[PDB]
Amino acid sequence: KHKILHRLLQDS
Amino acid sequence: KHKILHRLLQDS
Amino acid sequence: DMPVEKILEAELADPVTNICQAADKQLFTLVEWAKRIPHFSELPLDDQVILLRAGWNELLIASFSHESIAVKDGILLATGLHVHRNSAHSAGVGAIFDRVLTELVSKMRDMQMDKTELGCLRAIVLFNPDSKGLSNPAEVEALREKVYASLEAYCKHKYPEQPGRFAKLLLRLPALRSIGLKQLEHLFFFKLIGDTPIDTFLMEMLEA
Amino acid sequence: DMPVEKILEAELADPVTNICQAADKQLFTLVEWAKRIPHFSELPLDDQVILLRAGWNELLIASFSHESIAVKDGILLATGLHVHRNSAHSAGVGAIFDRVLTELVSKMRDMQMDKTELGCLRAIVLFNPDSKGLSNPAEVEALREKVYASLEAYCKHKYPEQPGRFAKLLLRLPALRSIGLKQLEHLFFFKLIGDTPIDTFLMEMLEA
Numbered sequence: 140k141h142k143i144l145h146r147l148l149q150d151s
Numbered sequence: 152k153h154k155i156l157h158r159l160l161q162d163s
Numbered sequence: 164d165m166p167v168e169k170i171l172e173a174e175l176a177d178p179v180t181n182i183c184q185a186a187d188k189q190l191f192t193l194v195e196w197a198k199r200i201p202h203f204s205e206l207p208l209d210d211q212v213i214l215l216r217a218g219w220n221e222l223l224i225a226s227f228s229h230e231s232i233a234v235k236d237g238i239l240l241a242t243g244l245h246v247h248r249n250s251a252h253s254a255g256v257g258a259i260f261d262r263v264l265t266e267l268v269s270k271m272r273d274m275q276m277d278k279t280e281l282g283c284l285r286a287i288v289l290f291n292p293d294s295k296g297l298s299n300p301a302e303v304e305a306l307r308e309k310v311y312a313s314l315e316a317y318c319k320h321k322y323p324e325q326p327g328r329f330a331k332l333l334l335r336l337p338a339l340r341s342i343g344l345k346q347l348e349h350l351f352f353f354k355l356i357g358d359t360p361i362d363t364f365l366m367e368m369l370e371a
Numbered sequence: 372d373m374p375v376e377k378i379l380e381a382e383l384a385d386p387v388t389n390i391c392q393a394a395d396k397q398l399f400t401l402v403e404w405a406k407r408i409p410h411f412s413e414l415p416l417d418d419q420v421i422l423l424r425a426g427w428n429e430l431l432i433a434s435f436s437h438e439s440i441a442v443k444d445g446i447l448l449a450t451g452l453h454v455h456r457n458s459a460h461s462a463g464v465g466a467i468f469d470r471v472l473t474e475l476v477s478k479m480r481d482m483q484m485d486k487t488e489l490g491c492l493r494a495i496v497l498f499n500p501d502s503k504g505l506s507n508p509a510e511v512e513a514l515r516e517k518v519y520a521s522l523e524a525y526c527k528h529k530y531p532e533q534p535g536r537f538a539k540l541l542l543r544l545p546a547l548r549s550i551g552l553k554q555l556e557h558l559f560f561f562k563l564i565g566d567t568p569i570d571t572f573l574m575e576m577l578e579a
Protein backbone atom coordinates (compact mmCIF):
# COMPACT_ATOMS: atom_id res chain seq x y z
CA LYS A 140 0.00 0.00 0.00
CA HIS A 141 2.17 2.91 -1.32
CA LYS A 142 5.41 1.54 0.21
CA ILE A 143 7.96 3.77 -1.57
CA LEU A 144 5.97 6.97 -1.16
CA HIS A 145 5.49 6.43 2.58
CA ARG A 146 9.22 5.54 2.89
CA LEU A 147 10.22 8.82 1.20
CA LEU A 148 7.77 11.11 3.00
CA GLN A 149 8.44 9.90 6.48
CA ASP A 150 12.19 10.37 6.46
CA SER A 151 13.64 13.81 7.26
CA LYS B 152 -23.16 16.74 -39.32
CA HIS B 153 -24.75 18.57 -36.32
CA LYS B 154 -28.08 19.18 -38.12
CA ILE B 155 -30.23 20.30 -35.15
CA LEU B 156 -27.58 22.54 -33.63
CA HIS B 157 -26.95 24.36 -36.92
CA ARG B 158 -30.75 24.68 -37.44
CA LEU B 159 -31.15 26.31 -34.00
CA LEU B 160 -28.15 28.63 -34.17
CA GLN B 161 -28.79 30.02 -37.58
CA ASP B 162 -32.35 31.16 -37.00
CA SER B 163 -32.97 34.56 -35.37
CA ASP C 164 -17.72 44.97 -23.66
CA MET C 165 -19.12 42.17 -21.43
CA PRO C 166 -21.63 43.35 -18.79
CA VAL C 167 -22.57 40.94 -16.03
CA GLU C 168 -26.11 42.29 -16.29
CA LYS C 169 -26.45 40.75 -19.76
CA ILE C 170 -24.92 37.47 -18.61
CA LEU C 171 -27.48 37.30 -15.80
CA GLU C 172 -30.28 38.07 -18.27
CA ALA C 173 -29.19 35.07 -20.37
CA GLU C 174 -29.38 32.83 -17.27
CA LEU C 175 -32.82 34.00 -16.25
CA ALA C 176 -34.39 33.46 -19.67
CA ASP C 177 -35.19 4.44 -14.52
CA PRO C 178 -33.40 7.47 -13.13
CA VAL C 179 -30.93 7.48 -16.01
CA THR C 180 -33.77 7.73 -18.54
CA ASN C 181 -35.25 10.68 -16.56
CA ILE C 182 -31.83 12.35 -16.48
CA CYS C 183 -31.21 11.87 -20.21
CA GLN C 184 -34.74 13.20 -20.94
CA ALA C 185 -33.97 16.35 -18.93
CA ALA C 186 -30.61 16.80 -20.66
CA ASP C 187 -32.18 16.68 -24.13
CA LYS C 188 -34.80 19.25 -23.07
CA GLN C 189 -32.08 21.55 -21.67
CA LEU C 190 -29.95 21.44 -24.81
CA PHE C 191 -32.62 23.56 -26.55
CA THR C 192 -32.49 26.05 -23.64
CA LEU C 193 -28.66 26.06 -23.81
CA VAL C 194 -28.64 27.25 -27.43
CA GLU C 195 -31.00 30.09 -26.49
CA TRP C 196 -28.73 30.93 -23.53
CA ALA C 197 -25.55 31.05 -25.63
CA LYS C 198 -27.17 33.38 -28.18
CA ARG C 199 -27.83 35.82 -25.35
CA ILE C 200 -24.21 35.86 -24.12
CA PRO C 201 -22.69 39.09 -25.49
CA HIS C 202 -20.80 38.61 -28.78
CA PHE C 203 -21.36 34.85 -29.05
CA SER C 204 -23.81 35.26 -31.98
CA GLU C 205 -21.26 37.43 -33.83
CA LEU C 206 -18.74 34.59 -33.98
CA PRO C 207 -18.69 32.59 -37.22
CA LEU C 208 -21.50 30.00 -37.21
CA ASP C 209 -18.97 27.15 -37.47
CA ASP C 210 -17.19 28.46 -34.34
CA GLN C 211 -20.47 28.76 -32.40
CA VAL C 212 -21.06 25.10 -33.28
CA ILE C 213 -17.52 24.13 -32.16
CA LEU C 214 -17.85 25.92 -28.80
CA LEU C 215 -21.22 24.42 -27.96
CA ARG C 216 -20.16 20.91 -29.05
CA ALA C 217 -17.04 21.28 -26.87
CA GLY C 218 -18.74 22.64 -23.77
CA TRP C 219 -22.36 21.49 -23.74
CA ASN C 220 -22.12 18.90 -20.98
CA GLU C 221 -20.03 21.06 -18.66
CA LEU C 222 -22.47 23.92 -19.30
CA LEU C 223 -25.43 21.67 -18.44
CA ILE C 224 -23.74 20.21 -15.36
CA ALA C 225 -22.88 23.65 -13.97
CA SER C 226 -26.50 24.76 -14.36
CA PHE C 227 -28.31 21.82 -12.76
CA SER C 228 -25.71 21.69 -10.01
CA HIS C 229 -26.43 25.29 -9.04
CA GLU C 230 -30.18 24.63 -9.25
CA SER C 231 -29.64 21.73 -6.80
CA ILE C 232 -28.33 23.74 -3.86
CA ALA C 233 -31.61 23.42 -2.00
CA VAL C 234 -31.96 19.65 -2.65
CA LYS C 235 -30.87 17.28 0.12
CA ASP C 236 -28.43 14.60 -1.21
CA GLY C 237 -29.70 14.87 -4.78
CA ILE C 238 -30.22 16.99 -7.87
CA LEU C 239 -33.06 18.95 -9.42
CA LEU C 240 -33.67 18.12 -13.09
CA ALA C 241 -34.87 20.50 -15.83
CA THR C 242 -38.12 18.49 -15.89
CA GLY C 243 -38.74 19.49 -12.27
CA LEU C 244 -38.14 16.03 -10.74
CA HIS C 245 -35.53 15.28 -8.09
CA VAL C 246 -33.03 12.45 -8.35
CA HIS C 247 -31.80 11.30 -4.95
CA ARG C 248 -28.34 9.80 -4.66
CA ASN C 249 -29.93 6.53 -3.46
CA SER C 250 -31.70 6.28 -6.82
CA ALA C 251 -28.52 7.18 -8.76
CA HIS C 252 -26.65 4.49 -6.85
CA SER C 253 -29.42 1.96 -7.55
CA ALA C 254 -29.06 2.73 -11.27
CA GLY C 255 -25.33 2.04 -11.37
CA VAL C 256 -24.08 5.67 -11.59
CA GLY C 257 -23.57 6.35 -7.88
CA ALA C 258 -19.87 7.31 -8.02
CA ILE C 259 -20.14 10.04 -10.70
CA PHE C 260 -23.36 11.30 -9.07
CA ASP C 261 -21.66 11.65 -5.71
CA ARG C 262 -18.81 13.62 -7.36
CA VAL C 263 -21.40 16.12 -8.63
CA LEU C 264 -22.83 16.43 -5.10
CA THR C 265 -19.47 16.74 -3.34
CA GLU C 266 -17.31 18.74 -5.73
CA LEU C 267 -19.98 20.98 -7.30
CA VAL C 268 -23.38 21.24 -5.57
CA SER C 269 -22.06 21.26 -2.00
CA LYS C 270 -19.34 23.77 -2.85
CA MET C 271 -21.74 26.06 -4.63
CA ARG C 272 -24.02 25.82 -1.61
CA ASP C 273 -21.28 26.48 0.95
CA MET C 274 -20.00 29.63 -0.77
CA GLN C 275 -23.56 30.70 -1.77
CA MET C 276 -22.53 31.04 -5.40
CA ASP C 277 -25.00 33.48 -6.99
CA LYS C 278 -26.60 33.38 -10.43
CA THR C 279 -24.38 36.13 -11.87
CA GLU C 280 -21.29 34.16 -10.82
CA LEU C 281 -22.76 30.96 -12.24
CA GLY C 282 -23.55 32.70 -15.53
CA CYS C 283 -20.03 34.11 -15.80
CA LEU C 284 -18.43 30.73 -15.08
CA ARG C 285 -20.80 29.29 -17.73
CA ALA C 286 -19.65 31.96 -20.23
CA ILE C 287 -15.98 31.27 -19.46
CA VAL C 288 -16.61 27.58 -20.21
CA LEU C 289 -18.47 28.51 -23.41
CA PHE C 290 -15.63 30.71 -24.68
CA ASN C 291 -13.12 27.84 -24.58
CA PRO C 292 -10.18 28.85 -26.80
CA ASP C 293 -8.70 25.32 -26.65
CA SER C 294 -11.63 23.92 -28.63
CA LYS C 295 -10.30 22.20 -31.73
CA GLY C 296 -10.96 23.63 -35.13
CA LEU C 297 -11.76 27.23 -34.17
CA SER C 298 -11.18 29.62 -37.00
CA ASN C 299 -9.68 32.22 -34.62
CA PRO C 300 -8.79 30.98 -31.16
CA ALA C 301 -7.51 34.44 -30.18
CA GLU C 302 -10.98 35.97 -30.69
CA VAL C 303 -12.52 33.40 -28.34
CA GLU C 304 -9.67 33.92 -25.87
CA ALA C 305 -10.38 37.65 -25.89
CA LEU C 306 -14.05 37.07 -25.10
CA ARG C 307 -13.12 34.71 -22.26
CA GLU C 308 -10.80 37.41 -20.86
CA LYS C 309 -13.62 39.99 -20.98
CA VAL C 310 -15.86 37.64 -19.00
CA TYR C 311 -13.40 36.96 -16.27
CA ALA C 312 -12.51 40.67 -15.99
CA SER C 313 -16.20 41.42 -15.51
CA LEU C 314 -16.62 38.56 -13.03
CA GLU C 315 -13.65 39.67 -10.91
CA ALA C 316 -14.99 43.24 -10.77
CA TYR C 317 -18.44 41.97 -9.78
CA CYS C 318 -17.07 39.76 -7.00
CA LYS C 319 -14.87 42.52 -5.53
CA HIS C 320 -17.82 44.90 -5.43
CA LYS C 321 -20.46 42.48 -4.10
CA TYR C 322 -18.24 40.44 -1.73
CA PRO C 323 -15.49 42.85 -0.65
CA GLU C 324 -14.83 40.83 2.50
CA GLN C 325 -13.91 37.75 0.36
CA PRO C 326 -10.80 38.68 -1.65
CA GLY C 327 -10.33 35.03 -2.69
CA ARG C 328 -13.84 34.55 -4.04
CA PHE C 329 -12.97 35.09 -7.70
CA ALA C 330 -10.17 32.52 -7.63
CA LYS C 331 -12.44 30.16 -5.69
CA LEU C 332 -15.03 30.34 -8.47
CA LEU C 333 -12.42 29.64 -11.18
CA LEU C 334 -11.00 26.72 -9.20
CA ARG C 335 -14.26 24.80 -9.57
CA LEU C 336 -13.53 24.56 -13.32
CA PRO C 337 -11.03 21.62 -13.08
CA ALA C 338 -13.59 19.61 -11.13
CA LEU C 339 -16.26 20.51 -13.71
CA ARG C 340 -13.81 19.42 -16.46
CA SER C 341 -13.19 16.00 -14.82
CA ILE C 342 -16.85 15.39 -13.93
CA GLY C 343 -17.91 16.25 -17.45
CA LEU C 344 -15.41 13.83 -18.96
CA LYS C 345 -16.59 10.95 -16.77
CA GLN C 346 -20.28 11.78 -17.32
CA LEU C 347 -19.70 11.76 -21.06
CA GLU C 348 -17.95 8.39 -20.84
CA HIS C 349 -21.03 6.93 -19.11
CA LEU C 350 -23.35 8.43 -21.71
CA PHE C 351 -21.32 6.98 -24.59
CA PHE C 352 -21.64 3.56 -22.92
CA PHE C 353 -25.43 3.96 -22.54
CA LYS C 354 -25.63 4.70 -26.24
CA LEU C 355 -23.45 1.71 -27.15
CA ILE C 356 -25.46 -0.81 -25.10
CA GLY C 357 -28.73 0.74 -26.37
CA ASP C 358 -30.91 0.12 -23.36
CA THR C 359 -31.44 3.81 -22.50
CA PRO C 360 -33.61 6.04 -24.74
CA ILE C 361 -31.57 9.01 -25.96
CA ASP C 362 -33.56 11.82 -27.69
CA THR C 363 -32.51 13.53 -30.85
CA PHE C 364 -30.44 16.50 -29.63
CA LEU C 365 -28.62 14.61 -26.93
CA MET C 366 -27.92 11.87 -29.50
CA GLU C 367 -26.56 14.41 -31.96
CA MET C 368 -24.13 15.66 -29.32
CA LEU C 369 -22.74 12.08 -29.28
CA GLU C 370 -21.93 12.10 -33.03
CA ALA C 371 -18.33 12.52 -34.23
CA ASP D 372 1.88 32.18 5.75
CA MET D 373 2.81 31.15 2.16
CA PRO D 374 5.71 33.16 0.65
CA VAL D 375 6.32 32.85 -3.07
CA GLU D 376 10.03 32.96 -2.30
CA LYS D 377 9.77 29.56 -0.57
CA ILE D 378 7.68 28.13 -3.40
CA LEU D 379 10.35 29.20 -5.89
CA GLU D 380 13.05 27.65 -3.69
CA ALA D 381 11.19 24.32 -3.84
CA GLU D 382 11.13 24.52 -7.66
CA LEU D 383 14.82 25.31 -7.99
CA ALA D 384 15.97 22.44 -5.78
CA ASP D 385 10.97 3.59 -27.89
CA PRO D 386 9.98 7.12 -26.95
CA VAL D 387 7.36 5.86 -24.51
CA THR D 388 9.99 3.88 -22.60
CA ASN D 389 12.20 7.01 -22.42
CA ILE D 390 9.24 9.05 -21.19
CA CYS D 391 8.25 6.50 -18.53
CA GLN D 392 11.92 6.30 -17.41
CA ALA D 393 11.98 10.09 -16.96
CA ALA D 394 8.67 10.06 -15.07
CA ASP D 395 9.93 7.49 -12.56
CA LYS D 396 13.10 9.53 -11.99
CA GLN D 397 11.05 12.71 -11.45
CA LEU D 398 8.71 11.12 -8.90
CA PHE D 399 11.62 11.08 -6.43
CA THR D 400 12.24 14.78 -7.14
CA LEU D 401 8.51 15.50 -6.72
CA VAL D 402 8.47 14.16 -3.15
CA GLU D 403 11.44 16.37 -2.29
CA TRP D 404 9.63 19.33 -3.92
CA ALA D 405 6.40 18.79 -1.96
CA LYS D 406 8.28 18.62 1.35
CA ARG D 407 9.66 22.09 0.61
CA ILE D 408 6.23 23.64 -0.04
CA PRO D 409 5.33 25.55 3.15
CA HIS D 410 3.14 23.55 5.55
CA PHE D 411 2.87 20.42 3.39
CA SER D 412 5.11 18.39 5.74
CA GLU D 413 2.96 19.42 8.72
CA LEU D 414 -0.11 17.71 7.26
CA PRO D 415 -0.83 14.21 8.56
CA LEU D 416 1.35 11.66 6.72
CA ASP D 417 -1.73 9.89 5.35
CA ASP D 418 -2.95 13.20 3.85
CA GLN D 419 0.45 13.94 2.27
CA VAL D 420 0.18 10.51 0.64
CA ILE D 421 -3.38 11.22 -0.57
CA LEU D 422 -2.43 14.59 -2.10
CA LEU D 423 0.60 13.27 -3.94
CA ARG D 424 -1.27 10.16 -5.19
CA ALA D 425 -4.06 12.46 -6.43
CA GLY D 426 -1.88 15.05 -8.13
CA TRP D 427 1.40 13.44 -9.13
CA ASN D 428 0.83 13.25 -12.88
CA GLU D 429 -0.57 16.76 -13.20
CA LEU D 430 2.36 18.01 -11.10
CA LEU D 431 4.83 16.22 -13.39
CA ILE D 432 3.10 17.39 -16.58
CA ALA D 433 3.10 21.03 -15.45
CA SER D 434 6.84 20.86 -14.73
CA PHE D 435 8.10 19.25 -17.94
CA SER D 436 5.75 21.41 -19.97
CA HIS D 437 7.28 24.58 -18.54
CA GLU D 438 10.78 23.15 -19.07
CA SER D 439 9.82 22.60 -22.74
CA ILE D 440 9.19 26.23 -23.68
CA ALA D 441 12.46 26.44 -25.58
CA VAL D 442 11.96 23.12 -27.45
CA LYS D 443 10.60 23.28 -30.99
CA ASP D 444 7.55 20.96 -31.44
CA GLY D 445 8.58 18.68 -28.59
CA ILE D 446 9.30 18.25 -24.90
CA LEU D 447 12.36 18.15 -22.68
CA LEU D 448 12.51 15.12 -20.39
CA ALA D 449 13.97 14.95 -16.86
CA THR D 450 16.72 12.71 -18.31
CA GLY D 451 17.80 15.58 -20.56
CA LEU D 452 16.59 14.06 -23.86
CA HIS D 453 14.09 15.69 -26.19
CA VAL D 454 11.04 13.92 -27.55
CA HIS D 455 9.85 15.43 -30.83
CA ARG D 456 6.18 15.21 -31.72
CA ASN D 457 7.12 13.16 -34.82
CA SER D 458 8.54 10.50 -32.48
CA ALA D 459 5.50 10.65 -30.18
CA HIS D 460 3.24 10.21 -33.20
CA SER D 461 5.36 7.28 -34.43
CA ALA D 462 4.89 5.62 -31.02
CA GLY D 463 1.09 5.83 -31.10
CA VAL D 464 0.63 8.70 -28.58
CA GLY D 465 0.56 11.63 -31.00
CA ALA D 466 -2.85 13.05 -30.02
CA ILE D 467 -2.21 13.39 -26.25
CA PHE D 468 1.32 14.66 -26.98
CA ASP D 469 -0.01 17.38 -29.26
CA ARG D 470 -2.49 18.44 -26.54
CA VAL D 471 0.46 18.98 -24.18
CA LEU D 472 2.19 21.11 -26.85
CA THR D 473 -0.88 23.15 -27.78
CA GLU D 474 -2.74 23.63 -24.51
CA LEU D 475 0.21 23.78 -22.09
CA VAL D 476 3.71 24.33 -23.54
CA SER D 477 2.70 26.84 -26.20
CA LYS D 478 0.52 28.79 -23.78
CA MET D 479 3.21 28.89 -21.15
CA ARG D 480 5.61 30.10 -23.83
CA ASP D 481 3.27 32.78 -25.21
CA MET D 482 2.57 34.35 -21.80
CA GLN D 483 6.18 33.78 -20.63
CA MET D 484 4.98 32.00 -17.51
CA ASP D 485 7.78 32.33 -14.94
CA LYS D 486 9.06 29.78 -12.44
CA THR D 487 7.37 31.42 -9.45
CA GLU D 488 4.02 31.25 -11.26
CA LEU D 489 4.67 27.64 -12.24
CA GLY D 490 5.56 26.74 -8.66
CA CYS D 491 2.41 28.39 -7.31
CA LEU D 492 0.19 26.62 -9.84
CA ARG D 493 1.99 23.39 -8.85
CA ALA D 494 1.25 24.09 -5.16
CA ILE D 495 -2.41 24.83 -5.92
CA VAL D 496 -2.64 21.44 -7.67
CA LEU D 497 -0.87 19.76 -4.74
CA PHE D 498 -3.26 21.23 -2.17
CA ASN D 499 -6.31 19.67 -3.84
CA PRO D 500 -9.13 19.67 -1.26
CA ASP D 501 -11.31 17.41 -3.46
CA SER D 502 -8.90 14.51 -3.00
CA LYS D 503 -10.80 11.57 -1.56
CA GLY D 504 -10.10 10.39 1.93
CA LEU D 505 -8.49 13.53 3.36
CA SER D 506 -8.76 13.70 7.09
CA ASN D 507 -9.49 17.46 6.97
CA PRO D 508 -10.37 18.86 3.57
CA ALA D 509 -10.80 22.36 5.05
CA GLU D 510 -7.14 22.45 6.14
CA VAL D 511 -6.00 21.65 2.59
CA GLU D 512 -8.48 24.18 1.20
CA ALA D 513 -7.00 26.83 3.48
CA LEU D 514 -3.49 26.11 2.23
CA ARG D 515 -4.68 26.29 -1.38
CA GLU D 516 -6.26 29.68 -0.62
CA LYS D 517 -2.98 30.96 0.87
CA VAL D 518 -1.14 29.94 -2.30
CA TYR D 519 -3.48 31.65 -4.67
CA ALA D 520 -3.53 34.81 -2.51
CA SER D 521 0.26 34.88 -2.70
CA LEU D 522 0.24 34.19 -6.44
CA GLU D 523 -2.25 36.97 -7.19
CA ALA D 524 -0.18 39.46 -5.17
CA TYR D 525 2.99 38.39 -7.00
CA CYS D 526 1.39 38.75 -10.43
CA LYS D 527 -0.06 42.20 -9.69
CA HIS D 528 3.32 43.43 -8.52
CA LYS D 529 5.48 41.87 -11.26
CA TYR D 530 3.07 42.28 -14.20
CA PRO D 531 0.98 45.36 -13.34
CA GLU D 532 0.15 45.93 -17.01
CA GLN D 533 -1.56 42.47 -17.18
CA PRO D 534 -4.55 42.58 -14.80
CA GLY D 535 -5.86 39.29 -16.22
CA ARG D 536 -2.64 37.34 -15.73
CA PHE D 537 -3.65 35.66 -12.48
CA ALA D 538 -6.92 34.36 -13.92
CA LYS D 539 -5.06 33.30 -17.07
CA LEU D 540 -2.71 31.16 -14.99
CA LEU D 541 -5.60 29.50 -13.11
CA LEU D 542 -7.46 28.83 -16.37
CA ARG D 543 -4.72 26.46 -17.52
CA LEU D 544 -5.76 24.10 -14.69
CA PRO D 545 -8.81 22.57 -16.51
CA ALA D 546 -6.59 21.72 -19.48
CA LEU D 547 -4.00 20.23 -17.11
CA ARG D 548 -6.82 18.22 -15.46
CA SER D 549 -8.03 16.79 -18.81
CA ILE D 550 -4.52 16.11 -20.16
CA GLY D 551 -3.57 14.34 -16.96
CA LEU D 552 -6.64 12.11 -17.10
CA LYS D 553 -5.93 11.05 -20.69
CA GLN D 554 -2.20 10.55 -20.02
CA LEU D 555 -3.06 8.34 -17.08
CA GLU D 556 -5.46 6.30 -19.21
CA HIS D 557 -2.64 5.62 -21.70
CA LEU D 558 -0.25 4.64 -18.91
CA PHE D 559 -2.76 2.18 -17.42
CA PHE D 560 -3.04 0.59 -20.87
CA PHE D 561 0.76 0.32 -21.20
CA LYS D 562 0.84 -1.47 -17.87
CA LEU D 563 -1.99 -3.83 -18.85
CA ILE D 564 -0.41 -4.88 -22.17
CA GLY D 565 3.01 -5.19 -20.46
CA ASP D 566 5.22 -4.26 -23.36
CA THR D 567 6.59 -1.05 -21.78
CA PRO D 568 9.01 -1.22 -18.81
CA ILE D 569 7.56 0.70 -15.85
CA ASP D 570 9.97 1.32 -12.91
CA THR D 571 9.07 0.86 -9.30
CA PHE D 572 7.78 4.30 -8.26
CA LEU D 573 5.80 4.94 -11.40
CA MET D 574 4.34 1.42 -11.04
CA GLU D 575 3.37 2.10 -7.44
CA MET D 576 1.47 5.20 -8.54
CA LEU D 577 -0.64 2.82 -10.70
CA GLU D 578 -1.71 0.67 -7.70
CA ALA D 579 -5.22 1.01 -6.23
Ligand SMILES: Cc1cc2c(cc1C1(c3ccc(C(=O)O)cn3)CC1)C(C)(C)CCC2(C)C
Nearest residue numbers: 183185186189223224227240241256259346349
Ligand atom coordinates in the same frame (compact mmCIF):
# COMPACT_ATOMS: atom_id res chain seq x y z
C1 LIG E 1 -26.98 13.18 -19.61
C2 LIG E 1 -26.35 13.12 -18.21
C3 LIG E 1 -26.10 11.89 -17.61
C4 LIG E 1 -25.61 11.80 -16.33
C5 LIG E 1 -25.32 12.97 -15.61
C6 LIG E 1 -25.52 14.23 -16.21
C7 LIG E 1 -26.09 14.30 -17.51
C8 LIG E 1 -26.27 15.68 -18.12
C9 LIG E 1 -27.51 16.39 -17.61
C10 LIG E 1 -27.70 17.62 -18.17
C11 LIG E 1 -28.78 18.40 -17.83
C12 LIG E 1 -29.65 17.93 -16.87
C13 LIG E 1 -30.80 18.83 -16.41
O1 LIG E 1 -30.69 20.07 -16.65
O2 LIG E 1 -31.71 18.37 -15.67
C14 LIG E 1 -29.47 16.64 -16.32
N1 LIG E 1 -28.40 15.88 -16.70
C15 LIG E 1 -25.58 15.99 -19.42
C16 LIG E 1 -25.10 16.70 -18.20
C17 LIG E 1 -24.74 12.94 -14.16
C18 LIG E 1 -23.54 13.86 -13.97
C19 LIG E 1 -25.84 13.51 -13.23
C20 LIG E 1 -24.23 11.58 -13.69
C21 LIG E 1 -25.06 10.47 -14.23
C22 LIG E 1 -25.35 10.40 -15.72
C23 LIG E 1 -26.61 9.55 -15.89
C24 LIG E 1 -24.24 9.72 -16.54
Ligand SMILES: Cc1cc2c(cc1C1(c3ccc(C(=O)O)cn3)CC1)C(C)(C)CCC2(C)C
Nearest residue numbers: 391393394397431432435448449464467554557
Ligand atom coordinates in the same frame (compact mmCIF):
# COMPACT_ATOMS: atom_id res chain seq x y z
C1 LIG F 1 4.45 8.76 -17.87
C2 LIG F 1 3.93 9.72 -18.95
C3 LIG F 1 3.47 9.21 -20.16
C4 LIG F 1 3.07 10.05 -21.18
C5 LIG F 1 3.09 11.44 -21.00
C6 LIG F 1 3.51 11.97 -19.76
C7 LIG F 1 3.98 11.10 -18.75
C8 LIG F 1 4.40 11.72 -17.42
C9 LIG F 1 5.80 12.31 -17.47
C10 LIG F 1 6.21 12.84 -16.28
C11 LIG F 1 7.44 13.41 -16.15
C12 LIG F 1 8.27 13.48 -17.26
C13 LIG F 1 9.61 14.19 -17.14
O1 LIG F 1 9.75 15.01 -16.18
O2 LIG F 1 10.46 14.12 -18.07
C14 LIG F 1 7.86 12.88 -18.48
N1 LIG F 1 6.62 12.30 -18.57
C15 LIG F 1 3.70 11.29 -16.17
C16 LIG F 1 3.47 12.69 -16.64
C17 LIG F 1 2.62 12.44 -22.10
C18 LIG F 1 1.67 13.50 -21.58
C19 LIG F 1 3.89 13.21 -22.55
C20 LIG F 1 1.88 11.82 -23.27
C21 LIG F 1 2.41 10.47 -23.61
C22 LIG F 1 2.57 9.43 -22.51
C23 LIG F 1 3.60 8.41 -23.00
C24 LIG F 1 1.27 8.64 -22.20
